[PDB]
Design a protein around this nucleic acid. Structure first.
Lengths: 135, 131
RNA sequence: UAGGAGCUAGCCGUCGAAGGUGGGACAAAUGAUUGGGGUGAAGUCGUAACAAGGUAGCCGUAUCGGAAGGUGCGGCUGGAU
RNA sequence: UGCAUUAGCUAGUUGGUAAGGUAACGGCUUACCAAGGCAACGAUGCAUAGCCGACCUGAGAGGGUGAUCGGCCACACUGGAACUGAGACACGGUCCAGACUCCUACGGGAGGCAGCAGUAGGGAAUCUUCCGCAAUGGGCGAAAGCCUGACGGAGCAACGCCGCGUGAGUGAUGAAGGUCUUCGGAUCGUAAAACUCUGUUAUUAGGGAAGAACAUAUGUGUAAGUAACUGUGCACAUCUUGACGGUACCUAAUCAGAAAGCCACGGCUAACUACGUGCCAGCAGCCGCGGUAAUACGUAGGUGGCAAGCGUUAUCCGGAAUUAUUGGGCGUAAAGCGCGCGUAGGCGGUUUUUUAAGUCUGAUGUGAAAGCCCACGGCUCAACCGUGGAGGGUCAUUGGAAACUGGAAAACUUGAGUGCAGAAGAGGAAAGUGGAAUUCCAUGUGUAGCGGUGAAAUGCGCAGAGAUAUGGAGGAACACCAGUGGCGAAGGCGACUUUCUGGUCUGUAACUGACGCUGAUGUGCGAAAGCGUGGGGAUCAAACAGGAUUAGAUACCCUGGUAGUCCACGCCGUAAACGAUGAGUGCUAAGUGUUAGGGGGUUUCCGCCCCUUAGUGCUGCAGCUAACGCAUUAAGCACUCCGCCUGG
């Protein structure tokens, strides 16, 4: 590329693709508007868990979660933990992550927000919580 | 194509000095030959021999190189064209590479040179990066 | 009597958020509605192409195809015989 | 303002003259002015907007940065008319629509959170319908006053930390201590009981104290002193002052006292091997483990990396210049164009010469905070605050002058434009070279399977299908010239006499002075499948027939035959059009035999030898990428443009 006939367009770097539509979404209910304000506080509703009649060979027997927070908008997320109260009509909060031996699933649901269960089977990873922060 | 002889003729010369061809030709000129006169006085080459013709004649070149068959012609370049030049002044000019570089020379206030104006506060013009 | 000219009491035209009318636009639910892909054992098809994938053929290319596949005319090597 | 998957924008318009009015000045309206003016400078229009620093930060380049936080605009129930205070559309002004709110005893009235708290609410987030004007602040007011919801404070907090935090190891290694046993005494261990060394933080109980001074508060009287002492400033000095402190400082009261968890014990995770553990549970970060020998799932005494410590979540960057003048390339890889032909342009070659306008301003007044150098004070260190110089050495202000230029006067010629042979021309076309079996056999016949075919039947078979020639014609359709050859915008370009020989083409090039590549323009088509008329089923030909392999068709098989095939009137913008490789100036040791055109020697007997280039090929130097492999003619080298893309 030239420089003097480059004044019609500079020789520069490139641009961004789509990333995490849910992390940074909002909603204005005034005039059927649709907003964005970059907050982790965006909600949904607890619906479903399951799969369908295979074609590809991905072997895994673990929980699917079409399961979300207060106000309904359909997503595909994860319910961590084995003990869980996520059947219907739940409210939660969500953060990110993926533990191994899990195919493709890449988010979470925080424990003990509004309407879920707690963590039971781990006793050697003891002293978390970091803010109300004694020894 | 030869805004600089280092532009297109260097396609020939960079191999010509690999093969020790210590003499060549150049278009007739007065500033172009002046800068090579600076360089041969520095001892890049033997001497800028002179023109046979009048208008764009053959100025003879006589290119000495390093006694070790080495070449310190570390690139020299310019962009002259009707459409590309400096309609612009070295009433001040700095230097690069701690004064080792010595290259093209062109302006108008009062005769010094690229390396002969390193100290003036009305400098010169440097392009190459010699060391 | 300001009556003369006058402004309020009276008449000739102005916009005004407003107000409500009208046809388009966007939507959202979605309709005993509805097209593309992926996805989850692929049970559907041979390992269809990769060993000339069992027959080198190919590229634009009528062609039908639930899916690996096929037959027509112009350029081609991206081939063991 | 940014933005065409937003383009042709606009009409007293394009904003002087006369009337009018802004402290100023106007099409601001009017009698005149041109359809003009605005233009892919993407005007129009869409989106958006209070703006800067602010922070973080890529090597420097320097930048994204508004929450706060500071500065600079606009709005204060929405809106509309007027009034207005010098200015108001007014945070707490009228009439109002509007809207709701409340009231209604109906007769009508208005209200009116964007001060600052909290009220419903929410959240991860905003405290507390927080304190008082204590001080400072200012509007009006001598004096004096209030607003304080300004101001300062009270609580809030690893949002992020910080110093102290956890103080003493001596005598039995064993006074006592056990993940892993075909245990040895070492042993989380002179640790340990009990404390060598001790009295800080630790709580502490008060003397208490500074700060607590600033502001008047008193005439003794001074200054303004008015004709003069005086009311105010105030030398007196009556001693104030906290939205904070009987707490700090101190006695040391206090005692070895009143103050520490992480993934794991997995290769990389350093945290030990074990068991219930048998790819199960489930820990689970690059990746795992787990299947009768789990280190790992679960668990564990220690246990690891640092400690008020533990891991994450949105933002930027380290990571990774894996985001490129500086600090990307594009054949394959992130990417290089059927194509070429073209205007502005980018860049096309310059040889001279004048200006000082810019090409590290001279030196200084000279410089935004969490941010140009040092000094500081306080910070339990800190947590964090501020202060001065340097005010810079950073802009302004003064300068004029090379060997570029803008400007100014000359010409030259490689990138541009004018003879020639016209060789090959298939560039792409214009007239001739002017017609058969295959369709019946009418002359004449003679036969069963010609056939279709792997083998066969179909189609064809009796004029006797296929037959004969002077004779009887044509339906689609005119292979010499034979090597690594010549041309077009391409698709591509093929019979030849010829054409223009246009143009290549090399030998001459006879000659004015940058007159070009790519790229706004614009140039055309691009092959077929298919494509808008007679032909066309004549050939071929899908379909059908009809045949069947060996133990399988209607298929490899196809004549009759469906069109189609095809040429005299319309083309698409597609091919492995591939160069997977875009087109200008020139080389990269170069070589290489050669078509063309030439110089020729020798002329040969049209040939041997040298120079030759557009190429032609071949290799082959440098270079090239990972290698494929490219290269004097790229997949290199230094000057031109183009477009592509830096995840897909």
């Amino acid at each position: 590329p030239t420089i003097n006939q480059l004044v019609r367009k500079p020789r520069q770097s490139k641009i961004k693709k789509s990333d995490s539509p849910a992390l940074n979404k909002g909603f204005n209910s005034k005039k059927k508007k649709f907003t964005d304000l970059n907050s982790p506080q965006k909600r949904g509703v607890c619906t479903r868990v399951g799969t369908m009649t295979p074609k590809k060979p991905n072997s895994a027997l673990r929980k699917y979660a079409r399961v979300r927070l207060s106000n309904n908008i359909e997503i595909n997320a994860y319910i961590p933990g084995i003990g869980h109260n996520l059947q219907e009509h739940s409210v939660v909060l969500v953060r990110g992550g993926r533990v191994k031996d899990l195919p493709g699933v890449r988010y979470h649901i925080v424990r003990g927000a509004l309407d879920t269960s707690g963590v039971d089977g781990r006793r050697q990873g003891r002293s978390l919580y970091g803010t109300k922060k004694p020894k | 194509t030869m805004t600089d002889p280092i532009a297109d003729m260097l396609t020939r010369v960079r191999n010509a000095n690999m093969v020790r061809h210590e003499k060549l030709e150049l278009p007739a000129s007065n500033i172009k030959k002046e800068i090579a006169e600076i360089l041969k006085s520095e001892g890049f080459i033997k001497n800028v021999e002179y023109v046979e013709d009048d208008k764009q004649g053959v100025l003879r070149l006589f290119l000495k190189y390093g006694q070790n068959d080495e070449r310190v012609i570390t690139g020299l370049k310019r962009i002259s064209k009707p459409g590309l030049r400096v309609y612009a002044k070295a009433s001040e000019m700095p230097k690069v590479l701690n004064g080792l570089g010595i290259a093209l020379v062109s302006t108008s206030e009062g005769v010094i040179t690229d390396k002969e104006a390193r100290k003036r506060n009305v400098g010169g013009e440097i392009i190459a990066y010699v060391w």
